[PDB]
Amino acid sequence: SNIEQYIHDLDSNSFELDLQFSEDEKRLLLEKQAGGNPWHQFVENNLILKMGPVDKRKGLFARRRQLLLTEGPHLYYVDPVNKVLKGEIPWSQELRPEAKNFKTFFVHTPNRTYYLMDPSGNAHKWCRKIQEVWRQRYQSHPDAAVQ
Protein backbone atom coordinates (compact mmCIF):
# COMPACT_ATOMS: atom_id res chain seq x y z
CA SER A 1 0.00 0.00 0.00
CA ASN A 2 1.08 3.41 -1.16
CA ILE A 3 2.82 5.88 1.12
CA GLU A 4 1.40 8.56 -1.24
CA GLN A 5 -1.55 8.77 1.17
CA TYR A 6 0.52 10.62 3.76
CA ILE A 7 1.93 13.07 1.23
CA HIS A 8 0.35 16.40 0.47
CA ASP A 9 2.06 18.06 -2.49
CA LEU A 10 1.53 21.83 -2.49
CA ASP A 11 3.66 22.70 -5.50
CA SER A 12 6.75 21.56 -7.34
CA ASN A 13 9.22 22.19 -4.51
CA SER A 14 6.80 21.98 -1.57
CA PHE A 15 5.01 19.25 0.36
CA GLU A 16 3.97 18.20 3.87
CA LEU A 17 3.40 14.84 5.51
CA ASP A 18 0.63 13.57 7.70
CA LEU A 19 2.55 12.26 10.68
CA GLN A 20 0.52 9.07 11.38
CA PHE A 21 2.63 6.58 9.44
CA SER A 22 4.12 3.33 10.73
CA GLU A 23 7.84 2.54 10.89
CA ASP A 24 7.57 0.39 7.71
CA GLU A 25 5.88 3.29 6.03
CA LYS A 26 8.56 5.65 7.25
CA ARG A 27 11.02 3.38 5.52
CA LEU A 28 9.28 3.79 2.18
CA LEU A 29 8.98 7.54 2.69
CA LEU A 30 12.73 7.75 3.39
CA GLU A 31 13.37 5.58 0.38
CA LYS A 32 11.43 8.00 -1.90
CA GLN A 33 13.24 10.92 -0.30
CA ALA A 34 16.78 9.48 -0.70
CA GLY A 35 16.08 8.25 -4.16
CA GLY A 36 14.32 11.30 -5.53
CA ASN A 37 14.33 14.41 -3.32
CA PRO A 38 17.13 16.80 -4.38
CA TRP A 39 17.22 18.34 -0.87
CA HIS A 40 18.01 15.02 0.83
CA GLN A 41 21.70 15.86 0.93
CA PHE A 42 21.14 18.80 3.28
CA VAL A 43 19.14 17.07 6.03
CA GLU A 44 21.47 14.59 7.72
CA ASN A 45 19.36 11.67 6.43
CA ASN A 46 16.35 12.92 8.46
CA LEU A 47 12.86 12.38 7.09
CA ILE A 48 11.52 15.61 5.64
CA LEU A 49 8.11 16.27 7.17
CA LYS A 50 7.54 19.60 5.41
CA MET A 51 9.52 21.60 2.93
CA GLY A 52 9.07 24.65 0.77
CA PRO A 53 10.45 28.04 -0.17
CA VAL A 54 10.44 30.98 2.24
CA ASP A 55 11.82 34.50 2.03
CA LYS A 56 13.88 35.17 5.14
CA ARG A 57 14.28 38.81 6.06
CA LYS A 58 17.89 39.98 6.22
CA GLY A 59 19.43 43.28 5.13
CA LEU A 60 17.29 45.34 2.76
CA PHE A 61 15.78 42.42 0.78
CA ALA A 62 14.67 38.99 1.91
CA ARG A 63 16.68 35.94 0.88
CA ARG A 64 14.98 32.97 -0.67
CA ARG A 65 15.68 29.73 1.21
CA GLN A 66 14.30 26.19 1.11
CA LEU A 67 13.04 25.49 4.62
CA LEU A 68 12.97 21.86 5.73
CA LEU A 69 11.20 20.64 8.86
CA THR A 70 12.48 17.14 9.61
CA GLU A 71 12.72 14.19 11.98
CA GLY A 72 14.99 14.99 14.94
CA PRO A 73 13.44 17.46 15.01
CA HIS A 74 15.27 20.01 12.83
CA LEU A 75 14.47 23.12 10.85
CA TYR A 76 17.13 23.50 8.17
CA TYR A 77 17.35 26.40 5.71
CA VAL A 78 19.20 25.99 2.44
CA ASP A 79 20.36 28.46 -0.22
CA PRO A 80 18.87 27.01 -3.41
CA VAL A 81 21.16 29.02 -5.73
CA ASN A 82 24.52 28.06 -4.22
CA LYS A 83 23.26 24.63 -3.05
CA VAL A 84 24.46 25.02 0.44
CA LEU A 85 23.00 24.70 3.89
CA LYS A 86 22.91 28.20 5.45
CA GLY A 87 21.83 27.31 8.92
CA GLU A 88 19.34 25.74 11.31
CA ILE A 89 16.65 27.19 13.53
CA PRO A 90 17.54 25.74 16.93
CA TRP A 91 14.96 23.49 18.59
CA SER A 92 14.06 23.67 22.27
CA GLN A 93 11.02 23.59 24.49
CA GLU A 94 11.00 27.38 24.12
CA LEU A 95 10.73 27.33 20.31
CA ARG A 96 7.39 28.86 19.21
CA PRO A 97 5.95 29.36 15.71
CA GLU A 98 3.56 32.27 15.17
CA ALA A 99 1.49 33.06 12.09
CA LYS A 100 1.36 36.83 11.65
CA ASN A 101 -0.85 36.73 8.60
CA PHE A 102 -1.50 34.40 5.64
CA LYS A 103 2.03 34.92 4.26
CA THR A 104 4.22 35.79 7.29
CA PHE A 105 5.31 33.57 10.15
CA PHE A 106 7.84 33.82 12.88
CA VAL A 107 9.79 31.14 14.65
CA HIS A 108 10.75 32.48 18.05
CA THR A 109 13.77 31.06 19.86
CA PRO A 110 15.64 32.30 22.93
CA ASN A 111 18.35 34.32 21.12
CA ARG A 112 16.65 35.02 17.78
CA THR A 113 13.33 35.34 16.00
CA TYR A 114 13.34 34.15 12.40
CA TYR A 115 11.10 36.31 10.19
CA LEU A 116 9.82 34.20 7.30
CA MET A 117 7.57 35.22 4.42
CA ASP A 118 5.85 32.37 2.56
CA PRO A 119 5.44 33.30 -1.04
CA SER A 120 2.71 30.66 -1.51
CA GLY A 121 0.48 32.16 1.19
CA ASN A 122 0.57 29.08 3.46
CA ALA A 123 2.07 30.40 6.69
CA HIS A 124 -0.56 28.67 8.76
CA LYS A 125 0.28 25.25 7.24
CA TRP A 126 3.91 25.88 8.30
CA CYS A 127 2.97 26.92 11.82
CA ARG A 128 0.59 24.02 12.40
CA LYS A 129 3.12 21.42 11.21
CA ILE A 130 5.95 22.93 13.29
CA GLN A 131 3.66 23.08 16.31
CA GLU A 132 2.45 19.47 15.74
CA VAL A 133 6.11 18.32 15.84
CA TRP A 134 6.70 20.46 18.94
CA ARG A 135 3.70 18.89 20.65
CA GLN A 136 4.85 15.39 19.89
CA ARG A 137 8.39 16.19 21.06
CA TYR A 138 7.62 18.02 24.27
CA GLN A 139 4.27 16.62 25.41
CA SER A 140 3.87 13.04 26.67
CA HIS A 141 0.16 13.28 25.87
CA PRO A 142 -0.43 16.09 23.33
CA ASP A 143 -4.25 15.88 23.58
CA ALA A 144 -4.23 16.58 27.34
CA ALA A 145 -4.88 20.18 28.51
CA VAL A 146 -1.75 20.10 30.70
CA GLN A 147 1.02 17.49 31.07
Q: Cα 139 to the chain's mean position, in Å?
A: 19
Handedness of CA 11, 17, 18, 24 (dihedral sign): positive
CA 14, 77, 73, 21: dihedral to nearest 10 degrees?
10
Burial class from Cβ neighbours inside 10 Å (0-12, 13-18, 19+) for residue 50 reads buried
Handedness of CA 18, 118, 116, 96 (dihedral sign): negative
- Measure the CA angle with vertex 131, ends 125 and 134; round to 5°: 145
- Full set of structural domains in the chain with CATH: 1-147 (2.30.29.30)
Given in angstroms, what resolution was this structure solved at?
1.5
Concatenated DSSP letters for 40-105? GGGTTTPPEEEEEEEEE--TTS-EEEEEEEETTTEEEEEETTTTEEEEEEPP-TT-EEEEEETTEE
* Pairing assessment for the beta strands 84-89 and 104-109 based on DSSP bridges: unpaired
Could you give the 3-state DSSP secondary structure of residue 16? strand
Contact (Cβ atoms closer than 8 angstroms) between residue 129 and residue 50: yes
Could you give the 3-state DSSP secondary structure of residue 129? helix
Residue 141 is classified by DSSP as S
